[PDB]
Curated annotation (Swiss-Prot):
Lineage of the species this protein comes from: Eukaryota, Metazoa, Chordata, Craniata, Vertebrata
Effect annotated for changing D223A: 10-fold decrease in binding to KIF21A
Tissue/organ expression: Widely expressed. Isoform 1 is predominantly expressed in heart and kidney. Isoform 2 probably is widely expressed at basic levels.
ANK repeats: 32-69, 84-114, 118-151, 156-185, 189-221, 223-248
Region (Interaction with KIF21A): 3-248
UniProt disease link: Cerebral palsy, spastic quadriplegic 2: A non-progressive disorder of movement and/or posture resulting from defects in the developing central nervous system. Affected individuals manifest congenital hypotonia evolving over the first year to spastic quadriplegia with accompanying transient nystagmus and varying degrees of intellectual disability. Neuroimaging shows brain atrophy and ventriculomegaly.
Protein name: KN motif and ankyrin repeat domain-containing protein 1
């Protein structure tokens, strides 16, 4: 015999059925008694979906049960943000639970561009998540193609590309670039990805960024320095030489 479905609790079921009849009534949603219902939804949803040991089969059975109740209900519950502004997407990306990440994307209702209170999008978090297999990297690529890869974080104005380059992650950089990441975006300090790669001596990353059409190696940070300036100050000569040739 094959596996057994995970069912919604009777409490969760009526919480969802109540939301179904109420979702399109702003006097009801914003009422105090309705918050008791929304808290129940939120509590059990994050329980099953946003823990390191969240079971993908359980998240899949929950997703499908929400759909069957209503697509409005599915949309509402998937996009719940906790007190930190974190959705299930944020959490399952950051915990490297990529099977769950795919289940969420396949529902086609996620707001992939929502930034938590710390200022980070799911794409940004993906650039920092561990990826141990090619199948997981494909799921991360699919996430990049769903949302805005060029969004700027609240902290320091950093993009996903800058975070990837900052930890020397060639795999992420290639994926981001393939999904139309803009290499010329500057952070609050005026720095680009190319300048970051140039400071840390990531030669291969520098080549990947210089190869992108429209790469502007003449840009300066707020101290007036270029990528070339920065490479030379850090003692990375081979990069400095590359930078000179491809800007001139």
């Amino acid at each position: 015999h094959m596996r057994e479905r995970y069912e919604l609790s009777e409490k969760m079921l009526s919480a969802c059925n109540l939301l179904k009849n109420t979702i399109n009534d702003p006097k009801a949603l914003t009422s105090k008694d309705m918050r008791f219902c929304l808290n129940t939804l939120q509590h059990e949803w994050f329980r099953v979906s946003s823990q390191k040991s969240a079971i993908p089969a359980m998240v899949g059975d929950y997703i499908a049960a929400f759909e069957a109740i209503s697509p409005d209900v599915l949309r509402y519950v998937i996009n719940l943000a906790d007190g930190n502004g974190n959705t299930a997407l944020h959490y399952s990306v950051s915990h490297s639970n990529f099977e769950i990440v795919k289940l969420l994307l396949d529902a086609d209702v996620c707001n992939v561009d929502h930034q938590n209170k710390a200022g980070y999008t799911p794409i940004m978090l993906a650039a920092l998540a561990a990826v141990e297999a090619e199948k997981d990297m494909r799921i991360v690529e699919e996430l990049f193609g769903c949302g805005d890869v060029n969004a700027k974080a609240s902290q320091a104005g950093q993009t996903a590309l800058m975070l990837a380059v900052s930890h020397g992650r060639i795999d992420m950089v290639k994926g981001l670039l393939a999904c139309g990441a803009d290499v010329n975006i500057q952070d609050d300090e005026g720095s680009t990805a190319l300048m970051c790669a140039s400071e840390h001596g990531h030669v291969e990353i520098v080549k990947l960024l210089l190869a992108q059409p429209g790469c502007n190696g003449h840009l300066e940070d707020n101290d007036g320095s270029t990528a070339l300036s920065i490479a030379l100050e850090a003692g990375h000569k081979d990069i400095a030489v590359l930078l000179y040739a491809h800007v001139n």
